Structures are given as C-alpha cells and as structure tokens.
Design a protein around this ligand. Structure first.
Ligand code: CLA
Ligand code: CLA
Ligand code: CLA
Ligand code: CLA
Ligand code: CLA
Ligand code: CLA
Ligand code: CLA
Ligand code: CLA
Ligand code: CLA
Ligand SMILES: CC(/C=C/C=C(C)/C=C/[C@@]12O[C@]1(C)C[C@@H](O)CC2(C)C)=C\C=C\C=C(C)\C=C\C=C(C)\C=C\[C@@]12O[C@]1(C)C[C@@H](O)CC2(C)C
Lengths: 41, 213, 230, 210, 217, 165
C-alpha cells in the first residue's frame, strides 16, 4: 500500500486531514475553555 | 503447501511462511511494506501478550468471584482497588505511564535501531537488551529460562503457540468487552448462563446482538 | 538405553543421560540451554534437599509433637528469642551460606577455601555437590547415591506439595490425613471431596483461616490457589 | 588482578585497585576510583575521614565509658550530641574561629604536601627542624612519628590503620543513625541490646517506632 | 557515545569535533537549534551563563531555605524575599535595579565583546592594567585569571570533568528554578516545604494530585 | 479609567446585558418540562452565560456605556492597567504560531528544492519530512534570528526583475 499512502500524502487529502485536525483542536479547546475573549488564565 | 485463512486463496507475496502465525491473512494489504510489516508484527505480539495477560487475569478473577472469594468483576476491579486501598488514581496512572514509557521507548528505539539498547547506557546492561529478533527480545531478563536458546524447532513451535494464543486472547478480550456491553455481567457468569441452557441463552437471545428478534 | 519417564519415548536431544536422575523428562525443553541447565540442576538439588529435610521434619514433628499442626507451627512455638531476633539470625546466616553457594554456582573454582582457617578447604568438586567437610562417610558409589538423592528429593518435593494441599483441604497433618484416608479410602480422596461438571463446581473449603494474629498483627493466611481448586 | 584479598571471593575485581593502596580489597562497585586522579584524592580523603572518625569515636565512647564507670568530669553525662550546648570558658563562636584558623594553617600545609610532595617538610621559623625526605602524602612521619614506628611493619600498620579507620567511620555513621532514631547515647544502646538482644534489633526498634 | 536517547540518531552538528569538545554533549538537539556552528557557540555561552546564574540562584534559594527549615536562619521564601529585603533596605527597588543594570551591563558588555572577538578585552590601555587579566583562556565561557583564584583550571587532567560537573549541575539547577516557579504557582508553598509534603505522603502529594498540572486527572 | 471606560464589574449596563440574556434563555426554558433534553441544553447555556460574564468581569475587562468589554491595543496602557492579556499577550502568542507555520513551510520548500522533481513533492507532501520540520519548528524565532544574522535568510540580487528594474 505504498501507492495508497502516496495518495493520502496528496495536497487535498493532507489538507483535509490537517484542517480537520486544526478545526477539531480549536473546537475542543472552545468546548473545554468556552468563550475565550482574553488571555487571563 | 501451507494452511491459509481462506482455503483455495493463494497467500499474498509479502506474507511468506516465515513469521509466526502466517496464514496469508491480509485482505487490506496493511503489511505490504516490509518495515511496516515488522512494526505490525511487533504490534501484534505486544497486543497479544497484553491480551493474554488480560484474559488470564479476567478469567482468574472471574473464577474467584464465581466460587465466592473476595473478588470484583473485571469491569469493577479498578474502582474497588483504588477505593479499598486509598490509592490516588492520577498518581497510579502517571507512575504506570512513567514505567511503561521507559519500557516502551526502549522498545521503540530498539525497533528503530536494533543495535541499540545494548551499549551499557541503562545500568551497564549490554546483552540483556540487545534483542534476538523483532518482537522477540530474549536475553537473561526477558527469557530467563533460555527457551529461545537451545532447541530451535521448540523455539519456532513456541513462537507459533505465542502468536496463536495471543490472537485467541485478543478475541477473548473483545468478547469480554462485548459480553459486558450486552449481558451486563461477568464472563464466567455468561459461561454459566450458557452451560445452564445452551439453547435460549446465547447472543441470539439478548435482544442486543440481533435486534431482529 | 536408559530407563525413561515414558518407556517408549525418545528423550530430548539435550538430555543425554549424563546427569543423575536424567530420565529424559523435559517436555517443555526448559533445560535446553546449557547455561540454564546448570542453574536448574542446582535448583533441583537444593529444592530436593530442602523438601527432604522439610518432609522428614513435618513427619517427625507430627510423631513427636502431634499436639501442634505443622501448618500452624510457625505461630505456636513462642520461643524466648522472639520472632525478629530469630528472623535476623536466620537472614544473616542463610545470606552467608546462600551467597557462598551462589558464588560456587557462578564461578565454580571460586569458593572452596575457609575464610578464617586457611588450612581447611574443599577439594575440587562438582557444582551442587560440595563434598569435603560436607560429606564424611559416603556409603558406596557416588553416582548411584546422587541418583538416590535426586529420586528421594523429587519424591519429597511432591510430598511437601502434598502436605500443603492436604493440610489446606483437610486441615490435618500428613500422618493424620493418611489415617483419615485409611479409615475411609473411598470417601476421603480429593475426587470424593470435590467435583466439577458443566453446570456446577464443588470445591473443598479450606480448613486454614484467612488470617492469624501472631502478636499484634494479622498475618494473611491464604489457601494456595483456591478458586482453581476442583 | 591477582590473588590479593577481596571483598567478595571470586568476584572479578575492577583492576585499577592493585594493592598499592592500604586496605585494597577491590571494593569499588560504583567505580568511583576509576580515574587515577580521583583515586589519589580519595585515598587521602579516606585517610583523613578515617583518622578523624577514629578520634571521634574515641572521644564519644571513652567519655561515655568513663562516665558510666563513674569518674568525675564537669563534662560527664553530657551526650556527644549535646556537648555543643555545654558552657565552656569561651563561647563556641571563638572556638570555631580559632579552630578554623589553626586548621587553615595545618590543612593548607597538608594540601601543599599533597600537591607537591616534599614541600611542606620544613618549618617557617626553625629550619633546623624538618620532616624526613621520602615520605608520602597522608604519611608525613618524623615529628608525626616520634615513638619510632615506620622502620618496618609499615604495610601491616597501614592496613591496620585503614581497617580501624573504616570501622570507626562506620561507627560514627552508626552514632549518628542511633542518636537520630533511638535518641540516646551509643553505649546505652549497646547496654539495651545486651539486656535482651532478641527484642532490641534495629528491625524491632524501628517497627515499634512507627 | 553517552547519548540522551541511546537509540536516537544524534544530529550531525553535535557529533563534530567542534561540538564534542563542548561540555555535556549528549546529542540533545531535537529542534536543531545549534545546527549553525556560530549559533552553537553563542548558545553554549548562553547555556553556561544560564547554568551559573541558575546554580547561584537555586543555591541562594534552597540552602537558606534548608537553613531556615533547620532554624539556622530566618530567610523568607524566595517569592517573598524581595519585598522583605526592600522593606529593610536603604534604597527603592528602582534605584537598586538601575545601579544593578549599569554594573551588570558593563561586565556583560565586556563579556559580549569578548564573545564577538575572543581575547579582545586584553587590548592594552583599555582598563588600568587589569585588561591584561581579561584576555580569557583558549576556551570561550571559561575566562579564568581573576575568575579562577584557586587555579583549578590549570590541570588539563580534571578540566574536562570540571566542565562536565559545572554544566550538569547547572542544567539541574536550571530545572530546579523552573521547578521552584511551577511549584509556587501550583502549590503556594516553598520548595523545601514541597519536598517535606511529598516525603510525608508521596503517593497522594505530587503533581498528579494538585488541581493544576493534570486538570483531566 | 483609561478612555472613560468603566470596569465591567462596576458597569450596570453589563449586568443588564447579563440578566437580559438570561431572561431570553429562561423564557425559552419555560416552554419545556423539568429535565427535558431542551431543558438540559438551556440550563447548560445559562450556566455558560453566567460563567462567561463572571470570567469577563473577573479578567479586569473595561466596558463602555453599552456594557460591552472593550480591548486595549496599546502596550503601555495595557501593561500599566493590567490589560496585556487582551491584545498584547495574544499578539506574541499569535506571532509565535504564525512564524511557526511560515518557518515550517519555508524549511519544507528549501528541503524539497534539492530533489529532482521539487514540484511533485509539493502536490504530494513528504509527510515524514513535513512532520520532522513541524516538530523542530518550535524554535522558529531563535533559528530565524540566527538565519537572519548569517545573511542566509535573504536571497541576494539573484531574484528576477522586470526590464525597468
Ligand atoms: C481575524 C479575525 C478574528 C479574530 C482576531 C478572532 C478572534 C477570536 N475569535 Mg472570532 N471569528 C472570526 C475571526 C476572528 N476571530 C471569523 C471570521 C469568524 C466566523 C467564522 C469568527 C467566529 C467566532 C466564534 C463563533 C467564536 C470566535 C471566538 C474567538 C476567540 C477565540 C479564542 C480561542 O479560541 O482561544 C484559543 C486559545 C489558544 C491559546 C489557541 C492558540 C493556538 C495554539 C493551541 C497555541 C499553541 C500552544 C502550543 C505551543 C501547541 C503545542 C503543539 C500542539 C500540537 C500540542 C478570539 C477572541 C470564540 C470566542 O469565545 O470569542 C470570544 C467564539 O466562540 N470567533
Ligand atoms: C529539578 C528537579 C526537580 C525535583 C527534584 C522536583 C521535585 C519535586 N517536585 Mg518539581 N518540578 C520540576 C523539577 C523538579 N521537581 C520542574 C522542572 C517542573 C516544571 C515542569 C516541576 C513542577 C512541579 C509541580 C507542578 C509540582 C512539583 C512537585 C514536586 C514534588 C513531587 C514530585 C512531583 O509531583 O513530580 C514533579 C513533577 C514533574 C513534572 C517532574 C519534573 C522533574 C524534572 C524532569 C527533573 C527531575 C527528573 C530527574 C531525572 C529525577 C530526579 C532528580 C533528583 C534526584 C535531583 C517534589 C518535591 C509537586 C509538589 O509540590 O508536591 C508537593 C507539584 O505539584 N514539581
Ligand atoms: C501461550 C503463551 C505464550 C507462549 C507460548 C510464549 C512463547 C514465547 N515467548 Mg512470550 N509472552 C507471553 C506469552 C507466551 N509466550 C505473554 C503473555 C507475555 C507478556 C508477559 C510474553 C512476553 C514475552 C517476552 C517479552 C519475550 C517472550 C519470549 C518468548 C519465547 C521464549 C519463552 C518461551 O518459550 O515461552 C514458553 C511459554 C510457555 C511455556 C507458557 C507458560 C505457561 C504460563 C506460565 C501459564 C500460566 C500463566 C499465568 C496464569 C500468568 C502469568 C503471569 C506473568 C506475569 C508471569 C517464546 C517464543 C522471549 C523471546 O522471544 O525470546 C527470544 C521474549 O523476549 N515473550
Ligand atoms: C474467544 C472466543 C469466545 C468464546 C469462547 C465466547 C463464548 C461465549 N460468548 Mg462471546 N464473544 C466473543 C468471543 C467469544 N465468546 C467475541 C469476539 C465477541 C464479539 C463479537 C463476543 C460477543 C458475545 C456476546 C454479545 C454474547 C456472547 C456470549 C457468549 C456465550 C454464548 C455464545 C454466544 O452467544 O455466541 C457468541 C459467539 C461468538 C461471538 C463467536 C465466537 C468468536 C468468533 C469465532 C471470532 C471470529 C473472529 C474472526 C476469526 C475474525 C474477525 C474478522 C473478520 C470479520 C474479517 C459463550 C460463553 C453470549 C452470552 O453472554 O452468553 C450468555 C452473548 O450474549 N459473546
Ligand atoms: C576529635 C575530637 C573532637 C573534635 C573532640 C571535641 C570535644 N571533646 Mg573529645 N576526645 C577526643 C577527640 C575529640 N574530642 C579523644 C580522642 C578523646 C580521648 C577525647 C576525650 C574527651 C573527654 C574526656 C572530654 C572531651 C570533651 C570534648 C569537648 C570539649 C573539648 C575541650 O574542652 O577542649 C580540650 C582541649 C585541649 C587542648 C585538651 C587536649 C590536650 C591534648 C593532649 C593536647 C592537644 C568537645 C566537644 C569534653 C566534653 O565532653 O565537654 C563537654 C570532655 O570532658 N573529649
Ligand atoms: C564533626 C563536626 C560536628 C558535628 C557532626 C556536629 C553535630 C552537632 N552539633 Mg556541633 N559543633 C561543631 C562541629 C560539629 N557538630 C563545631 C566545630 C562547633 C564549634 C565549636 C560546634 C558547636 C555546636 C553548638 C554550639 C551546638 C552544636 C550542636 C550540634 C547538634 C545539632 C543538632 C541539630 O541539628 O539540631 C549536632 C549533634 C547543637 C547541640 O548539640 O544542641 C543539642 C548546639 O547547640 N554544635
Ligand atoms: C560499626 C558498626 C556498628 C555496630 C557494631 C553497631 C551496633 C549496634 N547498632 Mg548500629 N548502626 C551502624 C553501625 C553499627 N551499629 C550504622 C552504620 C548505622 C546506620 C545505618 C546504624 C544504625 C543503627 C540503628 C538505627 C539502630 C542500631 C542499633 C544497634 C545495636 C543493635 C544491633 C541492631 O539492631 O542492628 C543494627 C545493625 C545495623 C544497622 C547494621 C550495620 C552493620 C555495620 C555497618 C557493619 C558491622 C561490622 C561487622 C560485619 C559485624 C560487627 C563486628 C564487630 C563490631 C564485633 C548495636 C549496639 C539499634 C539499637 O540502638 O539497639 C538498641 C538501632 O535501633 N544501629
Ligand atoms: C544569583 C544569586 C543571588 C541573588 C540574586 C540573591 C538575592 C538575594 N538574597 Mg541570596 N544568596 C545567594 C545568592 C543570591 N541571593 C547565595 C549563593 C547564598 C548563599 C551564600 C545566599 C544567601 C542569602 C541569605 C542568607 C540571605 C540572602 C538574601 C538575599 C536578598 C538580599 C540581598 C542582600 O543580601 O543584599 C546584597 C548583599 C551584598 C553583599 C551585595 C536578595 C533577595 C537575604 C534575604 O532574603 O533577605 C530578605 C538573606 O537573609 N541570600
Ligand atoms: C503604534 C504606535 C503607538 C502609538 C500611537 C502609541 C501611543 C501611546 N503610547 Mg505606546 N507603545 C507602542 C506604540 C504606540 N503607542 C509600542 C510599540 C510600545 C512598545 C511596547 C509602546 C510602549 C509604551 C509605553 C511603555 C507607554 C506608552 C504610552 C503611550 C501614550 C503616550 C500614547 C497613548 C505611555 C502611556 O501609558 O500613556 C499614558 C507609556 O507609558 N507606550
Ligand atoms: C538563570 C536561571 C535562574 C536564575 C535564578 C535566579 C537569578 C534567582 C534569583 C532569586 O531567587 C533568588 C536567588 C532569591 C530571591 O529572593 C530573589 C530571586 C531574584 C528571585 C534559570 C534558567 C532556567 C532555564 C531553563 C529552565 C531552561 C530550560 C531549557 C530547556 C529545557 C531547553 C531545552 C531545549 O533547548 C534544548 C536544550 C535543545 C532543543 O533542541 C530542545 C529543547 C527542548 C527546546
């Protein structure tokens, strides 16, 4: 499955995975630390 | 020629009859690359050894709880242990992760560098941590009885037995999980309920497994 | 050639019959490694000797003092040397002798010499069989006596395990349980106290309490592997 | 190595300890004296800690012994761990000051001998006085050897010195530990062990103390 | 080789002769910060200054802390000692900081210009004869001379191990100051009191059982 | 008291807005039973609202006549009056991450420039290389400064230009 993992390394798939990751990280940060208007913690 | 998981089907080229428990089972071709196959071999062995320990412990503690000794079920033993003994679960978890991180990082960096871990850096231990094969460390610490050493056919038979009991124990732990999620009771409670009425007491008569009826 | 544990089997390639008690029994191949075989030989010898001394000790303790249970004989002596003084003396003396034995096990030509009176030492011997001052009046050939030793020792190992498991199930000593079996041969077996079928499991309850006091503490006194008991 | 004595018969000793130092029994399981410079330092450190510990155990025991016998000092019955609170002609302040000045002198002298052997074998004032040439660091001799030893007997005596000194260092470690745990004097600990040795082990006392 | 991770691939810039001469080289550069030899030199200087400053400060924290836990002193906690010392002082903290920044900027600018050109402060006529003793030594960060009264750097037998002791105790002390900071922010007590509370109940008094370090646990 | 802005803990319009939002939520809550799924949701929303208002008033935020928190962008006013966590601290918090992204992408470009087909290493990402550089880009400020001081961050006049320069 060298070719399949080459496909997963393509720009659109890697972009989808990375932005799902970034968006999920931000979403979980905003779930556990809701409404962060200022850096106070 | 060699027993295959699907009789008639030729085995894939990357699964030569060399690894323990090689039955040509790779429909998704996950171990087609050799280095990935070594990684997955060690993963299978670690999973299966942890699952053998887990199935043995669940079975023993279920026997003890079934005959009446002072034992909780496997799904209740963590709470019972940390509350009977005043054990801080965070402390226990971080101690476990410290020790298992040492051990598993040694694992990882012997996989990445097999020649490593035997320089004498840990405590002067050189040959106790060099590793015999991938997934089969060996030595005076991991193989104190020397069963890998000496008889080689016995060693191959033991590799086969290890991987097969490990796959069986992985299936058994998956079964413990599913049986708790379905029947809501212990594994040997499930077994006694099945031995009581083999018919009318099985996965087809929970309403969970088969929702048709 | 030589008598085997199975009169029709072939012994493993690593059991050539040289050792005393070598009857071709290694179905798991634990003694396949030549280095592990020396350690297991020494462990068999010392287990045999400890178990022989211990079985003779329980028997003779049962004969001389039937007033006391050998399983309880640890908490019933009440010696004037207290528990911990005895434990310390035993710890240090056994540490000395077992470290000396261990040093003979690792580097065999190491410790034959007395560390006080240099004139006395042991002759060059085999590991596991010191000789010298340990062995005055060897009655007969040494090989047949090594065989006798290891055979009586395997029997005594099984005999101590039997003492334990017949003192946990019956709660009585070796000869007391033997008389219990002779007074009811068909009802006092472990088959007649226990039975598991697909649907129920009858196990013999332990006659040993789960804990005993012994001077202000509570020693956990568990049955060996209850639950796995039949 | 050789057929020398050993802290563990049959043990493969490290080797850099080859008898040239007194009390060489190969005991270096941490390999602290592997480098010869560190070994040259640790030999002198052992000698010094040893001799001071011998003096210390003497000055802790024989006062305790003379007090339990029943002799008369002003400083009798006062524990070794309480002799600092004792009142003398001077406060401990001035005593430490004088002690440190005098010990600066003599310890820097000893250190000059250690750095450059054969250098501190001469007086500042009375140059007619000197220490005999050919001495080693740790073994000055001369006025430090007035009763006339060191003619023969010297390896026997160095082995004796370092053995008694290791024993005394252990004895002072024991004084500290016993006074911290038992809170009493060391010879009274000996007396309480000789009263009934089977109910007064360290295991027994430490278990009863928790 | 004496690596930080026995099985790691050590970066090639820490295996060079110019880097294996540096004290405490265990191949730790997972971020590649010293791949540039000039940056590695500058960061070795930074490591030495941080390590010596941290050693001095952590000693001044825990030695008087241990001595006030043992009654020999009454020094306040390191997070309180500034207020206490400035309330007993002759000067406000502003003038103190100004004098300190001038006096430290002078010597640190001298050290800076010695890093820029090694052996440059020995330019004759700069100081009043003392510039003679400000050339440093062959090794940067190890100036010697007036900074070496006892002459322990003149051996070439204990020199490598002197270096190693310095850098290792200094890395340890840097970690110790970071730990002082984190333990104050997570416990509100002093470092020696934290040690005492851990030694009286280790299995329930640690960073896993405060509410700060592991909020999920 | 920076620009006529009152703290949100002392402003009455801020409390009015809090009670207004809570009144909206409870007027929605009156329609459902005690513990419904909507009731649970609205009670959680009310708790989040009260917590948000308490946490903004606790953070020393300044409010206007409308009762809304106003941020102080100026360093010097933010650091004098304790408003650095509004715009000043998150400024460097952002710049760290943005330089992280840029430095990692830059290092990836420079690393794949050497290959025979650098273009196919940009549509098909070298994931091990990218992850190595993403992990070791945490020290991007120091590495960027040291690459700036060597003169190797910038290209010289080898860049291309139009005919009138
Ligand atoms: C450029 C304009 C801009 C700006 C400055 C902001 C700024 C903000 N918005 Mg707004 N927003 C914008 C555009 C903008 N937004 C747009 C266009 C939309 C419509 C799509 C929205 C919709 C929107 C909503 C619906 C919400 C926000 C929220 C927020 C806040 C987010 C706080 C947060 O998530 O903490 C995150 C805190 C961090 C510390 C994250 C930093 C990132 C990483 C984790 C730091 C690195 C740590 C470490 C080094 C990582 C190690 C490695 C790692 C892999 C482990 C913040 C005030 C939320 C809020 O509460 O506002 C008050 C909110 O609910 N925004
Ligand atoms: C320099 C070494 C050092 C030492 C000896 C200690 C010791 C201690 N710390 Mg501190 N700590 C340190 C560094 C250190 N810390 C650093 C660098 C940090 C920041 C990450 C912290 C953050 C910290 C917090 C937040 C807390 C402690 C606490 C404690 C105490 C309990 C241990 C614990 O909860 O795990 C310590 C936590 C860690 C994350 C481990 C950091 C240790 C680093 C990696 C260096 C030491 C590792 C080294 C190989 C082995 C020990 C060396 C030693 C022999 C010198 C104990 C007295 C707790 C306390 O006050 O309990 C009363 C507590 O709540 N520490
Ligand atoms: C059926 C199970 C089984 C089998 C056949 C093997 C077989 C083997 N293992 Mg594996 N292993 C297992 C389970 C098993 N292992 C588990 C569960 C673990 C995790 C603890 C490991 C961890 C492990 C390591 C880390 C290493 C091996 C090695 C070996 C090889 C040499 C030892 C040998 O001959 O074992 C023969 C096995 C038996 C005769 C089975 C004994 C039956 C037991 C005692 C039943 C009772 C279990 C009991 C209820 C619970 C035990 C608790 C445990 C903590 C002790 C051989 C291929 C070594 C190797 O490859 O050397 C090169 C090596 O380095 N194994
Ligand atoms: C290790 C094997 C093993 C054994 C001996 C048992 C034994 C038992 N199970 Mg458990 N079980 C297992 C595995 C096992 N199970 C696994 C893996 C699952 C998850 C699917 C379950 C889920 C499960 C439920 C939900 C229930 C039981 C129940 C029972 C009892 C009655 C049998 C029954 O209902 O049919 C269950 C039999 C099976 C699921 C088949 C056995 C496992 C097969 C052979 C694994 C095949 C894997 C295959 C080779 C590879 C998979 C990949 C492939 C799809 C590509 C009996 C005590 C019932 C009970 O509690 O009795 C009162 C019950 O309600 N089991
Ligand atoms: C090493 C060492 C050290 C540091 C001490 C320290 C001390 N001893 Mg001990 N002592 C030692 C060795 C040591 N002793 C030895 C080897 C013997 C034998 C004694 C016998 C001894 C007795 C019998 C007494 C002390 C006392 C004392 C204390 C006061 C000494 C004094 O007044 O100066 C004495 C200073 C002198 C110069 C006299 C020494 C004369 C020599 C020969 C010339 C130098 C002090 C705590 C006294 C005490 O406990 O007071 C409370 C006390 O009564 N010591
Ligand atoms: C070998 C060196 C040595 C050792 C091991 C000790 C050990 C001790 N001294 Mg002493 N002391 C020494 C040298 C030494 N001292 C010197 C050179 C002086 C100056 C002359 C003193 C002056 C001194 C005083 C004045 C006091 C101690 C005290 C103590 C005790 C402190 C107990 C505690 O921490 O609380 C302890 C037994 C104290 C003590 O015994 O109180 C019970 C005390 O008050 N010491
Ligand atoms: C110089 C050696 C030496 C000697 C002769 C003693 C003797 C004694 N100790 Mg002390 N002790 C020592 C060193 C020594 N100790 C050291 C170094 C420590 C620090 C760990 C202690 C800490 C200590 C405590 C905490 C206690 C004693 C107690 C005792 C007494 C009872 C013995 C016991 O319970 O086991 C103690 C034995 C040990 C701690 C083992 C140390 C063995 C040493 C290092 C080597 C022995 C040399 C040799 C092999 C045998 C002796 C030969 C010769 C002296 C005849 C006894 C009077 C107890 C007491 O007060 O009784 C009333 C008690 O509670 N000891
Ligand atoms: C980086 C090194 C460093 C720094 C910045 C400080 C800073 C401070 N120390 Mg500490 N200290 C240090 C190292 C350091 N110390 C070391 C290495 C030791 C051990 C020798 C001490 C032992 C120590 C004690 C015992 C005391 C201080 C005190 C002080 C404070 C007053 C300074 C002073 O005495 O006037 C300047 C002094 C000059 C000689 C100039 C100040 C917070 C005092 C304090 O906390 O008062 C509240 C105090 O009582 N320090
Ligand atoms: C972008 C341009 C800019 C402008 C127009 C102002 C405007 C002002 N600054 Mg700010 N300032 C800025 C950038 C700016 N600042 C930057 C980049 C810094 C460095 C962090 C500062 C640091 C700073 C300080 C330290 C102070 C001001 C102060 C002031 C006031 C005079 C005024 C409101 C002063 C102030 O607080 O006004 C009352 C004051 O003390 N400024
Ligand atoms: C200088 C220092 C401490 C100095 C302390 C001082 C002066 C204390 C002074 C005082 O307390 C006293 C004395 C008394 C108080 O009353 C007053 C004050 C004034 C409070 C600490 C440095 C502390 C510095 C620290 C902790 C630095 C840690 C750096 C690490 C871990 C770097 C790791 C890596 O960079 C490498 C090495 C390689 C990369 O590839 C990978 C990564 C991981 C990025």
């Amino acid at each position: 499955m060298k070719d399949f993992t080459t496909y997963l390394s393509t720009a659109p798939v890697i972009a989808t995975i990375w932005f799902t990751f970034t968006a999920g990280l931000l979403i979980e940060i905003n779930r556990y630390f809701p409404d962060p208007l200022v850096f106070s913690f | 020629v060699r027993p295959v998981w699907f009789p008639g089907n030729p085995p894939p080229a990357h699964l030569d009859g060399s690894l323990a428990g090689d039955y040509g089972f790779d429909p998704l071709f996950l171990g087609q690359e050799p280095q990935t196959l070594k990684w997955y071999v060690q993963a299978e062995l670690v999973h299966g050894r942890f699952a053998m320990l887990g199935a043995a412990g669940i079975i023993l503690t279920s026997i003890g709880a079934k005959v009446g000794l002072g034992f909780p079920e496997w799904y209740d033993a963590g709470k019972v242990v940390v509350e009977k003994n005043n054990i801080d679960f965070p402390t226990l978890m971080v101690i476990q992760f410290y020790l298992m991180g040492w051990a598993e990082t040694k694992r990882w960096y012997d996989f990445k560098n097999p020649g490593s871990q035997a320089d004498g850096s840990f405590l002067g231990f050189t040959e106790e941590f060099k590793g015999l094969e991938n997934g089969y460390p060996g030595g005076r610490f991991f193989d104190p009885m020397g069963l890998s050493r000496g008889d080689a056919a016995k060693y191959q038979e033991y590799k086969q037995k290890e991987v097969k009991n490990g796959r069986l124990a992985m299936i058994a732990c998956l079964g413990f999980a599913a049986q708790y999620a379905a029947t809501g009771k212990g594994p040997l409670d499930n077994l006694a309920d099945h031995l009581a009425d083999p018919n009318h007491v099985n996965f087809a008569t929970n309403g969970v497994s088969i929702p048709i009826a | 050639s030589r008598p085997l544990w199975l009169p029709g089997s072939t012994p493993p390639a690593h059991l050539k019959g040289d050792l005393p008690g070598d009857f071709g029994f290694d179905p798991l191949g634990l003694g396949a490694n030549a280095e592990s075989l020396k350690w297991f030989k020494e462990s068999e010898l010392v287990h045999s000797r400890w178990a022989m001394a211990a079985v003779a000790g329980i028997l003779v303790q049962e004969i001389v003092r039937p007033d006391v249970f050998w399983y309880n004989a640890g908490k019933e002596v009440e010696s004037p040397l207290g528990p911990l003084g005895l434990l310390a003396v035993e710890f240090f003396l056994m540490h000395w002798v077992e470290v000396r034995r261990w040093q003979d096990l690792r580097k065999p030509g190491s410790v034959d010499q007395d560390p006080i009176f240099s004139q006395y030492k042991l002759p060059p011997h085999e590991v596991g069989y010191p000789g010298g001052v340990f062995a005055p009046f060897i009655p007969g050939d040494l090989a047949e006596l090594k065989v006798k030793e290891i055979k009586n020792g395997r029997l005594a190992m099984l005999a101590f395990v039997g003492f334990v498991m017949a003192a946990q199930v019956t709660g009585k000593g070796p000869i007391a349980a033997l008389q219990e079996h002779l007074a009811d041969p068909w009802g006092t077996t472990i088959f007649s106290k226990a039975a598991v079928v697909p649907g129920q499991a009858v196990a013999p309850p332990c006659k040993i309490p789960a804990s005993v006091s012994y001077k202000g503490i509570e020693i956990p006194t568990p049955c060996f592997l209850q639950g796995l008991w039949p | 190595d050789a057929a020398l004595p050993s802290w563990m018969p049959g043990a493969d000793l490290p080797g850099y300890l080859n008898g040239t130092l007194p009390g060489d029994f190969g005991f270096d399981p941490l390999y602290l004296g592997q480098d010869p410079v560190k070994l040259k330092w640790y030999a002198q450190a052992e000698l010094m800690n040893a001799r001071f510990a011998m003096l210390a155990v003497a000055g802790i025991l024989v006062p305790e012994l003379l007090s339990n016998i029943g002799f008369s000092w002003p400083g009798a019955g006062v524990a070794w761990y309480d002799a600092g609170k004792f009142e003398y002609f001077a406060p401990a302040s001035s005593l430490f000051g004088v002690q440190m000045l005098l010990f600066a002198w003599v310890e820097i002298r000893r250190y000059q001998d250690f750095v450059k052997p054969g250098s501190a074998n001469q007086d500042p004032i009375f140059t007619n006085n000197k220490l005999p040439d050919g001495n080693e660091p740790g073994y000055p001799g001369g006025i430090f050897d007035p009763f006339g030893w060191s003619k023969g007997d010297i390896k026997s005596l160095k082995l004796k010195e370092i053995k008694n000194g290791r024993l005394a260092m252990l004895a002072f470690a024991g004084f500290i530990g016993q006074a911290y745990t038992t809170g009493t004097t060391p010879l009274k600990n000996l007396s309480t062990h000789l009263a009934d040795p089977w109910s007064t082990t360290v295991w027994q006392n430490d278990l009863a103390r928790l | 080789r004496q690596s930080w991770l026995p099985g790691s691939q050590i970066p090639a810039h820490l295996d060079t002769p110019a880097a294996q001469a540096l004290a405490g080289n265990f191949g730790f550069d997972p971020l590649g910060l010293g791949k540039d030899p000039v940056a590695l030199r500058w960061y070795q200087q930074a490591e030495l200054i941080h390590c010596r400053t941290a050693m001095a400060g952590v000693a001044g924290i825990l030695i008087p802390g241990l001595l006030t836990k043992a009654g020999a002193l009454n020094v306040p906690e390191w997070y309180d000692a500034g207020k206490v010392a400035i309330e007993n002082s002759f000067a406000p903290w502003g003038s103190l900081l100004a004098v300190q920044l001038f006096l430290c900027g002078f010597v640190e600018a001298k050290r800076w210009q010695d890093i820029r050109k090694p052996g440059s402060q020995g330019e004759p006529g700069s100081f009043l004869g003392f510039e003679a003793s400000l050339k440093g030594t062959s090794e940067l960060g190890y100036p010697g001379g007036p900074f070496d009264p006892l002459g322990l750097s003149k051996e070439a037998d204990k020199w490598a191990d002197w270096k190693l002791k310095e850098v290792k105790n200094g890395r340890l002390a840097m970690l110790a100051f970071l730990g002082f900071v984190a333990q104050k922010y997570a416990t509100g007590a002093g470092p020696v009191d934290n040690l005492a509370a851990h030694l009286k109940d280790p299995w329930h008094v640690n960073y896993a059982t405060n509410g700060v370090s592991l909020p999920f646990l | 008291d920076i620009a006529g802005l009152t703290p949100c803990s002392e402003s009455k319009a801020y409390a009015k807005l809090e009670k207004k939002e809570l009144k909206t939520l409870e007027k929605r809550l009156k329609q459902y039973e005690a513990d419904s799924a909507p009731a649970v949701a609205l009670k959680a929303t009310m708790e989040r609202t009260k917590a948000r208002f308490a946490n903004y008033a606790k953070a020393g935020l300044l409010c206007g006549n409308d009762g809304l928190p106003h941020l102080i962008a100026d360093p010097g006013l933010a650091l004098k009056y304790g408003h650095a966590g509004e715009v000043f601290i998150p400024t460097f918090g952002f710049l760290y991450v943005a330089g992280y992204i840029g430095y990692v992408g830059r290092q990836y470009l420079i690393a794949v420039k050497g290959e025979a087909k650098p273009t196919d290493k940009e549509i098909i990402i070298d994931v091990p290389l990218a992850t190595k550089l993403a992990w070791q880009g945490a020290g991007w400020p120091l590495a960027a400064v040291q690459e700036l001081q060597r003169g190797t961050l910038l290209e010289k006049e080898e860049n291309i230009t139009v005919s009138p320069r």
